[PDB]
Design a protein around this nucleic acid. Structure first.
Ligand SMILES: [K+]
Ligand SMILES: [K+]
Ligand SMILES: [K+]
Ligand SMILES: [K+]
Ligand SMILES: [K+]
Ligand SMILES: [K+]
Ligand SMILES: [K+]
Ligand SMILES: [K+]
Ligand SMILES: [K+]
Ligand SMILES: [K+]
Ligand SMILES: [K+]
Ligand SMILES: [Mg+2]
Ligand SMILES: [Mg+2]
Ligand SMILES: [Mg+2]
Ligand SMILES: [Mg+2]
Ligand SMILES: [Mg+2]
Ligand SMILES: [Mg+2]
Ligand SMILES: [Mg+2]
Ligand SMILES: [Mg+2]
Ligand SMILES: [Mg+2]
Ligand SMILES: [Mg+2]
Ligand SMILES: [Mg+2]
Ligand SMILES: [Mg+2]
Ligand SMILES: [Mg+2]
Ligand SMILES: [Mg+2]
Ligand SMILES: [Mg+2]
Ligand SMILES: [Mg+2]
Ligand SMILES: [Mg+2]
Ligand SMILES: [Mg+2]
Ligand SMILES: [Mg+2]
Ligand SMILES: [Mg+2]
Ligand SMILES: [Mg+2]
Ligand SMILES: [Mg+2]
Ligand SMILES: [Mg+2]
Ligand SMILES: [Mg+2]
Ligand SMILES: [Mg+2]
Ligand SMILES: [Mg+2]
Ligand SMILES: [Mg+2]
Ligand SMILES: [Mg+2]
Ligand SMILES: [Mg+2]
Ligand SMILES: [Mg+2]
Ligand SMILES: [Mg+2]
Ligand SMILES: [Mg+2]
Ligand SMILES: [Mg+2]
Ligand SMILES: [Mg+2]
Ligand SMILES: [Mg+2]
Ligand SMILES: [Mg+2]
Ligand SMILES: [Mg+2]
Ligand SMILES: [Mg+2]
Ligand SMILES: [Mg+2]
Ligand SMILES: [Mg+2]
Ligand SMILES: [Mg+2]
Ligand SMILES: [Mg+2]
Ligand SMILES: [Zn+2]
Ligand SMILES: [Zn+2]
Lengths: 109, 63, 91, 77, 15, 251, 50
RNA sequence: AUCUUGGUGGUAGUAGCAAAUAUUCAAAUGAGAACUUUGAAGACUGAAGUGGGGAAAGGUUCCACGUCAACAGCAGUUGGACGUGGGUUAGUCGAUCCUAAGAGAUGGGGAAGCUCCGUUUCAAAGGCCUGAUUUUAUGCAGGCCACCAUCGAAAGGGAAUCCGGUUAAGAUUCCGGAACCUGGAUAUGGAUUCUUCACGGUAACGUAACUGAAUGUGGAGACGUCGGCGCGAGCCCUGGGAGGAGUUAUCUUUUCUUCUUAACAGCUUAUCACCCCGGAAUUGGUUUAUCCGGAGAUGGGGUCUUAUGGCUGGAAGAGGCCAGCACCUUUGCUGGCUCCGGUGCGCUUGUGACGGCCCGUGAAAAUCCACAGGAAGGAAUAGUUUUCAUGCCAGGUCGUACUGAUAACCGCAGCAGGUCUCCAAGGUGAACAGCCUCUAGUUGAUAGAAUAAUGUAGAUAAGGGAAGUCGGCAAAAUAGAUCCGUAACUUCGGGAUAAGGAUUGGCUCUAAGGGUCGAUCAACUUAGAACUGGUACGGACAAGGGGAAUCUGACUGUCUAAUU
């Protein structure tokens, strides 16, 4: 029925120039520029989206409190829970096997 | 008035058709409806204990 | 129903290109799109993703391999040669 | 911008140092039944934010208008 | 947090 | 006459390599103390397609010996190397596929790849998919390994020159026919402007030695002297013989 | 040309001011030989070439 | 001297002013009206528009007042003309910042030299942090790291704004209201601490906060394309009701139309993923698409992202629609209503989880955050903390009118040419085809009279049917859909819509195919039957001619812009 215009001078359908149509309190359709959608932060080990962390465009992370950007654990908003569990197991077991490695070497001496 | 008459089944014979059967209504759309009906009914029966999980599994593959 | 007598995956090429080229493409097309057995996790989930790169869906381990199959014959005989020579030097 | 529910909190706002104006709007509404009632919205202007208290019971409304400070420049409607 | 923000806090405490 | 196609290439304007999507140059680590005297362990973090190249690359991460930091190298992946695998590089690294050893430190018959021509060149020989060098001999007096290259040339190199154990991955690439002009189009889109190619006999005399004539034909011998000059070297340069090779090419 | 440089806009402003006929009183001056504005420009006739 | 420059004829009141369906009546204005303005009528574009905006380009063409000598190949009172003025308002939209292909100083090296190379190099190539000192904003105190200028996007990356109103001409820029970002300053509350730098939850993780230097590691920025499926939005369609308008010989509980809700904020809301319990063959779960499970399935119970939706604030006070009084009033004034639903292989668009494809695997940098680390500092009658709330100040510079083309750009021009892109209604129909219509826009393009030849564009034709002609050139015939029926040959994929047939309207019915809790609600698809007519019926529009062979190039693809 009613047709709409871009509200900015960019007339092309680029990634930065997306619109949705919206009905206003004046009863008329109008374009509304949409920002690009945020992607979820991803784990530094497996690549999965981190649970509990907010999804925002990069610079919006500067405006929000620390609880939106972290979780309450070792490697909070950086590695996922199962990645931290493997790091802990591996650290514990390899550091033990090192004690055994040295003793077995020290016996053979 | 025309839409009402089409609801009653008029204006729909061979001389009023110009798209193919598929163009009019895709055979895939007809399959998806059908298999979604059968899958729904099987789930209902299984969940009310009208059929066991063993009959379910066989019927699901036959659907 | 069986849909082709012989062209198989190469039925996408229709009558073009020559039977002998279609037939050679068919052998390598089957190999390149097969699922392979993962040496790590044991499941049949290794699929190609770009020539020489073979990734498991389950465990996420990638392996360098052949262009169209996970392991080329040359690389097998090398593994065996290297093992042989490794054991010669180590006593 | 912001709806405030607690009346204790609303009264703190009226006495805040940056708060020079308020508004009292009366809406004629209808409840679950078709019985009508006078909703009142109290709105205090603040600085960053307008705050509204919605009071449906016109008793509590009448009390609330009295307990606003006399410094506050209140616009009726 | 960015260096400019860290520096701001450091000035705020230096008073 | 005008400047022919083969002479326009050296100016390197539209004929430069298309490098936007490449990962970086594949190269061994710089040859340092650790590699000369012991070994250093790195991890294979990723195995990744490089545009333009057959073989996949391996992103190997090593610790820096002198500074607290990590150092990603880009190796050409040998067949069989996997993400998470540890790689050992140096004089004392063991004889396993993916490790980087000096050629002095490997027995006769070892298969290696990405071999250095001179020590510390960071890799030169057998880098294309499916290729490798064979060690065929040592000369410990002169400190010189002898090796067979993919071409079948034999070559003597320093025993300090390094290689990677095993064969470059992605082998058997050139067994699949391209089938379509379009596939060759996409192949050369990620390399350089070398395709398609007009035949010299389909051109006019101004454009190529072969051009012209009331039939398409070369008209003089196609074999050209090594001492010919730019603008003449089209056809078969310095050919020892010509015609269909009746036999095996191996030495 | 909606989004234009200042330098271009400054040249256009100059062109606006020059776009006028000769002031009539010049004709009355002693020994005047200027009859009309011989450097008048119009957007439909001749382009400014920037 | 096809002489040079200038001027002028005959030709000649001649060729001509014929593409884009189309004009008509009246009044007004005026010396004058086919052409201006208003009204009435008739038409057209027909949403892949003759509509509404922009990019390049133009540069005032925008708007008003005056106004017709020239220009608008007729006219002219009209104008993109002429004369005189008016007009473009930003912390949030762009530029500005970043890097891309690339361009390019310096150190150096070439070159007689104009200059050339090269872009981090065979260079002694810098500039931050913190405390102070209270001498002062530099030496001093310490530390810290050292890569290599700069330019290069008004479509890439990127801090932040919305609604309503307002002008002759400006508006995401003005006004009113309501927000937000960055930088700065900063003190009040809250929080934290005598177990100094918070607690809860088995856990996934939660919360209003909840120290953290150097250095390091991660993430976001950041990415192909196609396919079906799911979900959202706007639109379309449709029910009830409350208003206004139309039709009314007859019929029509009728036809048309209004019934809206921004950014922002609070609470709540999910596919995926994940956690706990549990321990699976009589294998189960499960997608339209067959994948998943002892590396822990199904099941029971939880956690999370907030795309997106709901409710509330914003906000009815706005906007919309009506009525009743005012009255060539500033232009009012007063009152009412502005509500509740349904539907889907719909359209457009956003998005999710997936799948296909590659010898193709589909930018970079600024910038922002988190983590690891533990430098350093910090309490008891008082210390810490502005990543929690609230509060204070500032946000420069340049662009901003209008056209964007059958008259604002380029093509000597007001030229049937050319020139990047967004939005997109109803019917018919497979359809963004063709044809008709609504919103919006236009009704321009020299006219009048007549109707010879010859044309150009469009048609039809008895009997014959390619006899025409270099040659079936041109035209005709065929054409949609459903059912039937399809040869040689073949690279077994094809050939194939082979060839060749039949059917098709209208009306009145029947049957089958679903959702939600026996009740109840709802789509279109398909098949059949009766009746019926000047045997018509893909009724306009739209829409293959086919076969038997030969030469030749394997195929799709490409070139002689303007004779191939
Ligand atoms: K959190
Ligand atoms: K080319
Ligand atoms: K060729
Ligand atoms: K020739
Ligand atoms: K600005
Ligand atoms: K830009
Ligand atoms: K991009
Ligand atoms: K994909
Ligand atoms: K020109
Ligand atoms: K004939
Ligand atoms: K072709
Ligand atoms: Mg959260
Ligand atoms: Mg269809
Ligand atoms: Mg199908
Ligand atoms: Mg070739
Ligand atoms: Mg030629
Ligand atoms: Mg020549
Ligand atoms: Mg020839
Ligand atoms: Mg020659
Ligand atoms: Mg000039
Ligand atoms: Mg005439
Ligand atoms: Mg003519
Ligand atoms: Mg006219
Ligand atoms: Mg038409
Ligand atoms: Mg029409
Ligand atoms: Mg005008
Ligand atoms: Mg005229
Ligand atoms: Mg005239
Ligand atoms: Mg003017
Ligand atoms: Mg901006
Ligand atoms: Mg230079
Ligand atoms: Mg720049
Ligand atoms: Mg941009
Ligand atoms: Mg305007
Ligand atoms: Mg304002
Ligand atoms: Mg689109
Ligand atoms: Mg404008
Ligand atoms: Mg405009
Ligand atoms: Mg337009
Ligand atoms: Mg022009
Ligand atoms: Mg034109
Ligand atoms: Mg239809
Ligand atoms: Mg006409
Ligand atoms: Mg006839
Ligand atoms: Mg006849
Ligand atoms: Mg006949
Ligand atoms: Mg004849
Ligand atoms: Mg004849
Ligand atoms: Mg013809
Ligand atoms: Mg045939
Ligand atoms: Mg047929
Ligand atoms: Mg051809
Ligand atoms: Mg031509
Ligand atoms: Zn992880
Ligand atoms: Zn695996």
């Amino acid at each position: 029925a009613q047709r709409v215009t871009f509200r900015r001078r960019n007339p092309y359908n680029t990634r930065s120039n997306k619109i949705k149509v919206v009905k206003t309190p004046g009863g008329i359709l109008r374009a509304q520029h949409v920002k690009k959608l945020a992607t979820r932060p991803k784990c530094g080990d497996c690549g999965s989206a981190l649970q509990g962390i907010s999804t925002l465009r990069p610079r919006q992370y500067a405006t929000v409190s620390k609880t939106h950007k972290t979780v309450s654990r070792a490697y909070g908003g950086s590695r996922c829970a199962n990645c931290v569990k493997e790091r802990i197991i591996r650290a514990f077991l390899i550091e033990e096997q090192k004690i055994v490695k040295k003793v077995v070497k020290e016996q053979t001496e | 008035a025309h839409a009402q008459s089409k609801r009653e089944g008029r204006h729909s014979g061979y001389g009023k058709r110009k798209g193919t059967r598929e163009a009019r209504l895709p055979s895939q759309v007809v399959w998806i409806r059908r298999l979604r009906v059968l899958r729904r009914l099987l789930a209902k029966y299984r969940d009310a204990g009208k059929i066991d999980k063993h009959l379910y599994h066989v019927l699901y593959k036959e659907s | 129903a069986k849909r082709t007598k012989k062209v198989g995956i190469t039925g996408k090429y229709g009558v073009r290109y020559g039977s002998s080229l279609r037939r050679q493409v068919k052998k390598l097309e089957i190999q390149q799109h097969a699922r392979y057995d993962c040496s790590f996790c044991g499941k049949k989930t290794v699929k190609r993703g770009a020539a020489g790169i073979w990734t498991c869906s389950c465990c996420k381990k990638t392996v360098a391999g052949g262009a169209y199959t996970v392991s080329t014959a040359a690389a097998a005989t090398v593994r065996s040669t290297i093992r042989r020579l490794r054991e010669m030097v180590e006593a | 911008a912001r709806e405030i529910t607690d009346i204790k909190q609303f009264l703190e706002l009226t006495r805040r140092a940056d708060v020079k104006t308020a508004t009292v709007k009366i809406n004629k509404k209808l409840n679950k039944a078709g019985k009508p009632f006078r909703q009142t919205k109290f709105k205090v202007r603040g600085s960053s934010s307008l705050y509204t208290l919605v009071i449906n019971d016109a008793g509590k409304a009448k009390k609330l208008i009295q307990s606003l400070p006399p410094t506050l420049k209140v616009n009726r409607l | 947090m960015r260096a400019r923000w860290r520096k701001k806090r450091t000035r705020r405490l230096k008073r | 006459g005008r400047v022919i196609r083969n002479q326009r290439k050296g100016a390197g304007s539209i004929f430069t390599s298309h490098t936007r999507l490449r990962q970086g140059a594949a190269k061994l680590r710089t040859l340092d103390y650790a590699e000369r005297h012991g070994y250093i362990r790195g991890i294979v973090k990723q195995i990744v397609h490089d545009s333009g190249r057959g073989a996949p690359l391996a992103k190997v991460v090593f610790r820096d010996p002198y500074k607290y930091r990590l150092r990603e190298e880009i190796f050409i992946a040998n067949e069989g190397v996997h993400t998470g695998q540890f790689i050992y590089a140096g004089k004392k690294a063991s004889l396993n596929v993916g490790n980087v050893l000096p050629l002095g430190s490997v027995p006769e018959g070892t298969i290696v790849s990405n071999v250095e021509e001179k020590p510390g060149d960071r890799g030169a020989l057998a880098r294309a998919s499916g290729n490798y060098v064979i060690i065929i001999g040592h000369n410990p007096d002169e400190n010189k390994t002898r090796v067979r290259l993919p071409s079948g040339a034999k070559k003597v190199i320093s025993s300090d020159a390094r290689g990677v154990i095993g064969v470059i991955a992605g082998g058997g690439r050139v067994d699949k026919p391209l089938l379509k002009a379009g596939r060759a189009f996409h192949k050369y889109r990620l390399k350089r402007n070398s395709w398609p190619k007009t035949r010299g006999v389909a051109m006019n005399p101004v454009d190529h030695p072969h051009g012209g004539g009331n039939h398409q034909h070369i008209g003089k011998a196609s074999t050209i002297s090594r001492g010919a000059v730019s603008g003449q070297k089209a056809g078969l340069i310095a050919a020892r013989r010509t015609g269909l090779l009746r036999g095996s090419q191996k030495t | 040309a909606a989004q234009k440089s200042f330098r271009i806009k400054q040249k256009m402003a100059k062109a606006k001011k020059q776009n006028r006929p000769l002031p009539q009183w010049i004709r009355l001056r002693t020994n005047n030989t200027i009859r009309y504005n011989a450097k008048r420009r119009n957007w439909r006739r001749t382009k400014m070439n920037i």
